Ligand binder design. Structure first.
Ligand code: ZN
Ligand code: ZN
Lengths: 197, 753, 197, 753
């Protein structure tokens, strides 16, 4: 069928629950309270593995059959919208036919060096604009070390502030519906036929 | 007959004995279906024979009011409704020959310090069922009309101070109560109490305005209005509002309870999936509105793979279209799909409520009697606190209360002195259509013979914060001694902006003013005075009353009075019809036929400069004005109007060969020629007076008729219907002229040859 | 059927073609050239009838079976529109039910004299506004005489100007479609198989 | 094989002999069906053998080009189309081994001083049939590419000076010709001719703008756009445009001619009635738009009683509605009715044309041969001079010609120096959507490395005469050395107005700029410099380049850089998704993962102040950024992010009993708790590294896990799906913690007891 298009296109779902020279510590890490508290909780091999993972950077490279109430794997599903605004119906494609010869909206001719420089400058400006939005401006003494950079960025928030002495959670009240009884029944009946003649 | 009356008395008293005894016996133990059935038949039996003798039933009810009130208050819906109807029959059906109905109403109000009536009002007046709300509205009306002053006051204060706060988050369920309060508060409340109520309603209006302005209802309202889905679908992926959408085996052992728990667990997943699908559809609806591509994907939280498959199968549209359904059909299909999903969500919510009710009944209410009323947990499952419709309805209730309180001078002063209340109300009315009418009405009340308020509202209209339509509404009510200022403002705005809406409103107001003169006598109508133009110019420019017009604060634009005649040939057909109707109405007034004829003759020259598709209303108006009467025809003939018409026809025929050779020009030529020929035929045809006119004026149109008929016959391929009609009418005129004057036709033919 | 309304209501059609003390002339009429010309065209009874008519004032008091191409009586058909604007759907009728008791939008209470005075003043202002729109402001010495008023209103337009010496109308050109013949046929054929070997 | 080649050559030349002889013989006398049938078979036979040896056919065609050109020019459509295809096969299909194709193209162009090619172009290139228009477009392309310089110039001047004026009033029929001119004029025209053509196109643009502004197309366009009928129904009661709507016995004696005349007479009445009905429907459509009642009646001219009965029967609607089709269904029904009437009018027009053609053929062409082409009187019956679509199409043709001429310096100067041409083009693009795209493209061409033009367009955008989207388009093309100014303007407008469209456009542009970095190597990407905030502040406030930022003409508002983060929780979901996509893209850049983590942690606190329905995209972005890599998980764990998450969970659980008891509050609580628990589970689950992290960090979350699990398990009636998911995940975490550390769990339970 050539007159039917896909205007709402689901993409691949990202699952939420996953399916289950030497490197030495710096001077700041050895003085860090949480680090020493960690060293007394696990073995030395585990600490070495944690440190190696910390200091390293990852090598970056129809029909419906499932029921609504079915159990499965939760995830995030992205939807792409290849639709046209209703106000733009029948517009914007006057010269869309490939058989036309006029030079249409093609990209300009640029050398490799100039293109790379322009791309890098545009990315730099965009990154500066986004980075200025942080409430606390981060200062990076050495950005090639990931742990140091993350520490410098996040150390002022005091994420490690332990919750205070915790108490028992007060239970949330439940939904109860007890129909009201007549107080007379839960505890003199006049003779209606006596008077009134 | 007295024996039968005594027998009926004993029968009803024994029936009520039976009703009370059986109600008590059923309430003793846990009842069943059969337990309340005979109660229902007993109630129906007393209902059937009660309307035979309503006065005696009133006496019986007044003797034992407390028992009936308790029965209505505590039993289930079936019993309580019939008992309430019995009370209404006892109260209203009497002929109020004495004070007995007054005593009955007083006993109902006073009973148990008003606890019983308060419970009845709380249960039925603001309940789910609309019929019971109307029933209690009628009962309250009767009781309030039929009670003493102190009891009336007690009941109204009870309705406002206690019942009204409970209906705060129910949109349309509090309509009847608000109506009763708005009707009876100004008569039984003191000035201080009215002022306090006005202040409370102002605070409620401000709170709702902040809520509407804060949660982004305006943009989403605009989105739903532009797509044509309507304002009732503001948040269709939300948990449904039960006010606006009105729409399991009895547990015995623990295994069935576990099954019910599992069913609830599955239903939660189903509801979540349905809401996710609705969210996806809402994102698509938003994408149809925004003009920017390649807009990014929207990510949803899903519990399984059902949603992805659903949108794979159903996420399609039709690129082929049949004109002019290129937009209507896809939107209709989208509305159908969203309706199906929303209905499914509503049924799921109802089933969840039923399941939880059954679990609660098994857990706790397994031994309660079936005769007692079972409350429904509606306040927990109803999301009315963030429903656009319910918020607008509560705003309407507050506006109604303010309008009702405006009759007090102190309350009116408080309303007028509030911090920019009028501007806020105007902006609210402008933004949302649902609030526009009633708010406008309140403004009309504040725009009474007060002049400063009118000046403030006019300044706000000039700024662009209040629609001009308010003024138009204010002009539709009489007995207002400040109508001249508003009329001046409307006329000036129509004269300046030349917008279609302003012109249409001004023309309709003027036409109504002219039409209203049919309600008086002819002697009054004959007293209209023909003032010169300088008087109306002074009235427009300055700020004087009409009777005083016999420094230039306001300045008129370039020639301003022509606007009306421009409206006679407007591109908007509603404005065209309005202006032509106004001209016809002017033609029917005293001493004003010459004015309409002069306007017609002056604007005749526009037929050659405007497309003929715009002139049609003017042609109809001209036909009507000329066909007003035979005397008008004779007067117009003596002024040589037929000579003008024949000259126009001659000029039109002589210039055909200069025009373009295409269908449009021929259509325009035919339409203009048809108008002229129809006017000439109407002038010269009719009764014997028109025959005399044709006979007298046949010397100056015979040769033109003959040659135009020949010229129109010479056309073979450029033929239109209007040209054929014109040729036929001209032939009729020529044939009727030459019926008894063949010598003149022969002489004319010889002169032309 | 209670769920169907009439949103477009035709009205009655006005047909276009109609179905076929003494009163003495004033001094201006006797001096009018057109009146003298009329006096020499018809009898005296006809002139008396015309004068009487001129000087007097009228006493003012489903299924489709007709085919599109049918012949009949032309006329003007007015259509009334009892429709609702789409932007106002489901609005403006919150208290429209007749069972409500609040005093709704009713007219104010006025005595007969005050109402008549107000109506007359409003009509006067409307008439003045409409009358100001004429290009030539009319002056009425006596508005109770209809002929005099019409003459005073319309005499400056010179409606009686006769068309000049009329000539023969030039006929409009007709639509002719004559296919273009080949000029060769309307008046040496090479031997294709001779050469080319 | 040479014998076979000679036989084929003789056969083809003999077939051409028969073709010419039979064509002449048939043209001698009035032919019939059988007269051209064998001609058609001869053409088919010579075609079927032509593709076998295209070079020999090319030679034969080049020898006798004039006869084939004459046959294509003069015969009917069936013969002419085949002859044109034969010529195309002869020209294109050769391998251009030598100059033979050049000579063939030159002879085609030069033949009879170009009369034959001019006639062919006039007949087929701008004809009714689109396939033949494309065929002639291809033939002209091949001839122009394959010819000499002088012949190319002659052909292009002929196309522009002669053929182009004829297609003035045909909307889409002149598209191919305009395309050819726009492609080949700048290469063969002199500067003076290009300037003259530019001036002519500017004059055409001004004339069309005056026509559009004068006949009231803007208001009626708005009316049709607001009702959803579409811009293609601007005047549906008008005589149909034949370009935009593509869709009798042979007279022998005078009686049949009289019957044909009577049929024409009846058809005129039928067409008039149909147009009157369409006018009534148009008046109803207008009434659905205007808000003022009791708007007056509209009067139509009728020829009979059919229209009144039609509107009595069909003038109904449905008050009942199924939500949310309260608007879509009536509009769809109205569109269906108008479509039916319009189709009937189109068929009536076609029938009228056929009847007049038959009458003309009988009167005059009763003896002409059937082999000659029969012209159709389309220019008379086509009302394209007042068609909105055709006017817009001709405007698009002029815009394309201007864009093609912009390559010349003198033409560009003339365009820039015209009287407010840029402002007029911007206003035209803003008013009508059909013209928006292409006009914008031309503006982008005028907004090249020139700076003054950019300043003028920016001033016009600030005034409100040109849409900001133009700049966005200008930012989608590289190699422009003035992009910084436009980027500054867009960023400032998004920062100030906070309109949904401006924010969406700015966010998409920034996201594209960030995504473009995947096209370069890692060494180039590692050269990003982390400049302080003062540099970007100076860039925004002043008018310096980026490299120079290392008097304050422009002033920033209150804290301006927060806008992006505000967009992370916008009420418009498109803006929400755009901002979150931008954040995820930032997370993937060099040395910028800590920045994204800091933004995430700073905005985590907003989850308690905003409704959870708005935060969902932020939750997805947080999940993605945390799940970027295992090393990120370890680094975040060492910074004690899990302690923060467990504190948030504890605080959320402890404050439940303070919240209102309704469905909405429980849903929000469940969603927030689910987000926190999912983040914690993602942090602590995965590979062996995450198992080590969970083992190391079990002392500071065990008791919280236990007590939160108990608290969630204690809920029975206020259950949501999110709460169940959170409970299940917490139970999984607790079970996995206590699998091999039961002693710690026992100690914790003892401490809690
Ligand atoms: Zn609601
Ligand atoms: Zn068209």
């Amino acid at each position: 069928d050539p007159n039917v298009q896909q205007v709402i296109r689901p993409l691949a779902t990202i699952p939420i629950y996953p399916p289950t020279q030497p490197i030495v510590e710096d001077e700041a890490l050895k003085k860090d309270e949480f680090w020493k508290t960690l060293k007394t909780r696990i073995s030395e091999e585990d600490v070495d593995l944690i440190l190696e993972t910390m200091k390293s950077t990852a090598k970056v490279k129809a029909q419906v059959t499932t029921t609504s109430d079915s159990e499965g794997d939760p995830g995030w599903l992205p939807l792409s919208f290849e639709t046209t605004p209703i106000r733009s119906t029948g517009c914007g494609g006057y010269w869309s036919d490939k058989r036309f010869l006029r030079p249409r909206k093609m990209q300009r001719e640029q050398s490799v060096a100039s293109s790379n420089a322009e791309i890098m400058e545009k990315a730099e400006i965009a990154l500066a604009l986004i980075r200025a939005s942080c409430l606390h401006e981060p200062v990076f003494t050495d950005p090639t070390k990931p742990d140091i950079a993350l520490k410098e960025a996040l150390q002022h928030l005091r994420l490690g502030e332990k919750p205070a002495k915790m108490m028992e959670y007060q239970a949330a009240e439940e939904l109860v519906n007890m129909p009201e009884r007549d107080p007379i029944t839960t505890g003199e009946i006049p003779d209606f036929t006596a008077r009134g003649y | 007959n007295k024996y039968k009356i005594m027998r009926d008395k004993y029968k009803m008293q024994d029936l009520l004995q039976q009703l009370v005894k059986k109600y008590l016996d059923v309430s003793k133990e846990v009842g069943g279906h059969q337990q309340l059935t005979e109660i229902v038949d007993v109630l129906a039996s007393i209902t059937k024979l009660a309307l035979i003798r309503p006065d005696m039933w009133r006496d019986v009810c007044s003797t034992h009011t407390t028992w009936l009130l308790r029965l209505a208050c505590y039993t289930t819906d079936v019993v309580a409704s019939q008992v309430v109807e019995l009370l209404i029959v006892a109260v209203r059906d009497s002929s109020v020959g004495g004070q007995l109905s007054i005593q009955l109403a007083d006993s109902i109000v006073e009973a148990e310090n008003g606890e019983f009536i308060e419970k009845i009002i709380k249960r039925f007046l603001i309940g789910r069922d609309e019929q019971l709300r109307w029933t209690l509205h009628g009962m309250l009306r009767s009781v309030i009309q039929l009670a003493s002053r102190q009891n009336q006051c007690i009941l109204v204060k009870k309705l406002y101070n206690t019942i009204y706060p409970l209906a705060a988050n129910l949109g349309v369920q509090g309509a009847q109560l608000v109506d009763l309060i708005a009707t009876y508060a100004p008569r039984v409340f003191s000035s201080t109490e009215l002022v306090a109520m006005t202040q409370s309603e102002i605070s409620t209006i401000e709170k709702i305005r902040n809520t509407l302005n804060g949660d982004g209802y305006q943009g989403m309202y605009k989105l739903m209005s532009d797509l044509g889905l309507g304002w009732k679908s503001i948040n269709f992926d939300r948990n449904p509002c039960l006010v606006c959408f009105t729409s399991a085996q009895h547990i015995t052992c623990d295994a069935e309870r576990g099954q019910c728990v599992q069913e609830i667990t599955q239903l939660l997943i189903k509801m979540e999936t349905t809401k996710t699908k609705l969210t996806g559809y809402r994102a698509a609806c938003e994408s149809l509105y925004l003009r920017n591509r390649p807009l990014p994907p929207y990510k949803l939280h899903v519990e399984n793979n059902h949603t992805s498959e659903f949108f794979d199968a159903n996420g399609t549209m039709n690129i082929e279209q049949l004109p002019f359904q290129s937009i209507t059909m896809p939107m209709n299909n989208l509305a159908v799909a969203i309706r199906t999903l929303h209905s499914e969500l509503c049924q799921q919510t109802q089933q969840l409520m039923y399941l939880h009710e059954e679990l609660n009944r098994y857990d706790h209410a397994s031994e309660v009697s079936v005769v007692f009323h079972k409350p429904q947990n509606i306040s927990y499952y109803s999301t009315g606190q963030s429903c656009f419709g319910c918020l607008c309805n509560q705003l309407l209730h507050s506006v109604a209360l303010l309008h009702s309180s405006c009759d007090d001078e102190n309350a009116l002063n408080l309303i007028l002195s509030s911090d920019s209340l009028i501007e806020k109300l105007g902006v609210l009315a402008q933004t949302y259509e649902t609030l526009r009418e009633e708010v406008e009405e309140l403004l009309v009340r504040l725009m009474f013979d007060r002049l400063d308020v009118t000046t403030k509202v006019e300044k706000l209209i000039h700024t662009g914060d209040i629609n001009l339509s308010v003024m138009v509404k204010s002009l539709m009510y009489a007995a207002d001694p400040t109508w001249q200022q508003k009329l001046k403002l409307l006329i000036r705005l129509a004269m300046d902006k030349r917008d279609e809406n302003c012109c249409l409103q001004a023309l309709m107001v003027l036409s109504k003013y002219l039409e209203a003169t049919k309600s008086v006598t002819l002697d009054e109508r004959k007293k209209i005075k023909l003032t010169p133009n300088k008087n109306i110019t002074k009235w427009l420019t300055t700020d004087e009353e009409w009777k005083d017009c016999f420094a230039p604060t306001k300045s008129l634009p370039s020639n301003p009075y022509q606007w009306i005649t421009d409206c006679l040939f407007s591109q908007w057909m509603s404005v065209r019809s309005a202006a032509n109707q106004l001209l016809v109405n002017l033609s029917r007034q005293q001493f004003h036929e010459p004015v309409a004829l002069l306007i017609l003759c002056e604007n005749m020259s526009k037929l050659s400069d405007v497309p003929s598709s715009v002139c049609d209303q003017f042609m109809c108006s001209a036909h009507t004005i000329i066909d007003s009467s035979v005397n008008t025809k004779a007067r117009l003939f003596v002024q040589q109007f037929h000579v003008y018409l024949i000259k126009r026809i001659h000029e039109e025929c002589a210039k055909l060969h200069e025009q373009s050779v295409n269908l449009l020009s021929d259509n325009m030529f035919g339409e203009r020629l048809r108008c002229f020929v129809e006017l000439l035929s109407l002038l010269l045809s009719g009764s014997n007076v028109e025959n005399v006119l044709l006979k007298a004026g046949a010397d100056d149109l015979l040769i033109f008729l003959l040659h135009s008929t020949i010229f129109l016959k010479r056309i073979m391929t450029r033929r239109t219907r209007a040209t054929d009609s014109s040729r036929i009418a001209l032939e009729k005129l020529l044939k009727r002229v030459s019926c008894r004057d063949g010598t003149k036709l022969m002489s004319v033919c010889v002169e032309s040859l």
